């Protein structure tokens, strides 16, 4: 679950929080849908809605985010896309 951030428009504190949150999510949850759901909900609570999370080993995306609320990073071989929009 070593973290490597590829792209972010996010404060440093939220970047660290995202990695730690996703890291715990992967420790706790086995299925990507549930990993994504956990992560999404934690941000809605702390950082207001509306957050969206994609978790997986094989995907591409093209999305629109609110400024300063985007991160894309890997934990090992698993990519996590986390952003706010709406």
């Amino acid at each position: 679950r070593k973290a490597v951030i590829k792209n972010a428009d996010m404060s440093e504190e939220m970047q660290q929080d995202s990695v730690e949150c996703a890291t715990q999510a992967l420790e706790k949850y086995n299925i990507e849908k549930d990993i994504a759901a956990h992560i999404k909900k934690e941000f809605d609570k702390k950082y207001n809605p509306t957050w969206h999370c994609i978790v997986g080993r094989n995907f591409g995306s093209y999305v629109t985010h609110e400024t300063k609320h985007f991160i894309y990073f890997y934990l090992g071989q698993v990519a996590i896309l986390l952003f706010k929009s709406g």
Partner: protein, 44 residues
């Protein structure tokens, strides 16, 4: 309320089934196998 509704969805793709297989060019009649009736002789 402008945000009259906020519908949440979960999405999960299926898994991919893979197997380990042996092959070898030089060898016995059975090339590779996955990791006693003998009715096979009777026709001859």
């Amino acid at each position: 309320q402008c945000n009259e509704d906020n519908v949440e969805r979960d999405i999960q793709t299926e898994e991919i089934e893979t197997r380990e297989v042996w092959t070898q060019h030089p060898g016995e009649s059975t090339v590779v196998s996955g990791g006693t009736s003998d009715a096979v002789v009777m026709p001859k």
